[model samples]
Target: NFMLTQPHSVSESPGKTVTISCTRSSGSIASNYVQWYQQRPGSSPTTVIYEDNQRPSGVPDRFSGSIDSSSNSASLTISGLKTEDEADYYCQSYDSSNHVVFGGGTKLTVL
Candidate 1:
């Protein structure tokens, strides 16, 4: 089984910036592709980051991602937080053993 570690939850006020972190146990970071997703309370997960740091079309510039190969970790940064941005963030990647894995998910609350 693949594993991803992340803070259980975080809170921030509207208009602030929030950063969610995820770390993988396997050598997935070095493999060079990490993806991040956002799932609203009742919607399907949407891709916010892919192929390490690329955002898909229609995603705002307020959302971004980065990776630290040395640490085997990746992070998602969301700026200009809005009430609608409240959701769960997940990190996904392929482990060195070629298994697809996802983070436990970080719940973001825009207060």
Candidate 2:
């Protein structure tokens, strides 16, 4: 299994935006759609973004994501960050076999 590394934790001022990035092999990012995950401790990871920047229904727009085609780097940008936004976030992509993949999760600390 391949492992992806991301910031284990980060802080952002209340109401400000913070971005967490994940890098993958060029071929991997190019071949599949990117998704974002948010989880709080024992809770299951929830999908934040799908197909890069698009959020699924019922997800707030504050959680946004995008990927750099050239570098195969995908990032999740949380806008208007709030205290409650503190949690673990992850970026993911699917392999050709349709298996799920995950990046090293990041923890957001609101300051």
Candidate 3:
């Protein structure tokens, strides 16, 4: 099965960069598809990263993802942070049982 981990909270100023860690285990990263989402207050989650590193339309290039099968981990990085970027970020992937799993969301704060 897959499980991911992220910092409980992160603080950064505008134009800075913050990287969210997503560590997994039991061959999850080997599955080669990790997804990331952003949830703003009072709004639904938005897909920011899909299929490990592909950013869907409307997602800025400042947001990117990467996976390391060797380490059973994945990560999402945001550059040029803006106040609007303050939100909860989640990492998700399919488990060995094909069950969807998500990391405890990380609260990103733009200071």
Candidate 4:
């Protein structure tokens, strides 16, 4: 099974844009659809992006997802960042055998 890799920490000022990349260890990142989640402290994870770039109901257009075949990676990009958006973000996908794999979540900090 392959793994997903992500940055441990990312910090930026509010109102700025941030793009977090989730790199696949092996195989093409496009082998399966990628999902993005936001996990706040003491709360359950919320789906922010699904099926690569589709935002779930109630989610704003500020959140987006995409996959780069050349880089073998997926990305979650947030624009007009807000301070309240500070939370852990994760990328999830399945392997060829249909086993779920998660990225080492990224800790987002708003300055």
Candidate 5:
């Protein structure tokens, strides 16, 4: 099965909001829960959003996620985008009790 990929590197100015979208080649993204991750140049990825909408403890409020079935796309919107937020962001989809599948990593550049 083909997995989803980040079509482009996400970028935004400080204090602004940016949306990074990921689309699955098959199936409805609305039915799947997406988990988002952040990774820098040399560091391992960290979880930002889990279960698609819930922000994990210690995660900032700016990081939000949503899914659109009509487009088969999952989006992560980070408000008040900051420099630290200038890392790669990716999404994972979970269907019930199965292994999670991650979208290809994306490099985020802050403008």
Candidate 6:
């Protein structure tokens, strides 16, 4: 099975930009659309980016998603980081079989 791997944890100062990556291990990363979710402690995860780069109505423009062919990976970039934005971020994608693959998730800290 394919896997989406992410960093265990990360930190950045307030208002700074941090990029979290999700590397695909089995096939072409761009073959499927990638989505990102943000989860704060004691709360349900929220969608931040979908269809690779499209942001939903409530999601801020500061969060974005991208795929790099050379890296065979997906990236979630958060700009103007804030304390409330600190949480666990998970990236997901589906394969031809329509099974969802999820990253291990990375924790973001605004220090």
Per-residue CA lDDT of candidate 3, range 1-111, in tens?
445666788788977888877776554474556788889868998887777678777878788677565655666667878887888888788745667777757888888
Better of 4 and 5 by TM-score: 4
Pairs with backbone N, CA or C atoms under 3 Å apart (clashes), candidate 6 = none
Model 4 C-alpha lDDT versus the unseen true structure: 0.79
State each model's CA lDDT, in order: 0.75, 0.74, 0.74, 0.79, 0.75, 0.78
Q: Once superposed on the true structure, which residue ranges of model 6 sit more than 4 Å away at CA? A: none
- C-alpha lDDT of candidate 3 relative to the true structure: 0.74
Pairs of residues at least 3 apart in sequence or in different chains that clash in candidate 4? none
Clash pairs, model 3 backbone: none
lDDT per residue (tens digit) for residues 35-108 in model 1: 87888756788887777668677887688677665766676677889987888887778745666777757788
RMSD of each: 2.0, 2.2, 2.2, 1.7, 1.9, 1.6
User: Which of the predicted structures, 5 or 6, would earn the higher TM-score when compared with the native?
Assistant: 6
Query: What ranking emerges by TM-score with the best candidate at the front?
Result: 6, 4, 5, 1, 3, 2
Clashes of 5: 0
For model 4, how does the per-residue alpha-carbon lDDT over 84-108 read when each residue is reduced to its tens digit?
7888888888756778877758899
Q: Report clashes for each candidate as comma-separated counts.
A: 0, 0, 0, 0, 0, 0
Residue 64 local lDDT, model 3: 67
lDDT of 2: 0.74
Number of the candidate with higher lDDT, 3 or 5:
5
lDDT per residue as tens, model 6, 1-111: 877777888788888888877777865676788888888868897878878878888777888677776657766667878886888888888767788777757887889
TM-score for all predictions?
A: 0.83, 0.80, 0.83, 0.87, 0.85, 0.88
Q: Candidate 1, after superposition: displacement of residue 37 in Å?
A: 0.8
- Candidate 2 local lDDT, residue 101: 79
lDDT of 5 by residue, 8-60 (tens): 66566777878777777765577777788887768887888788777777878
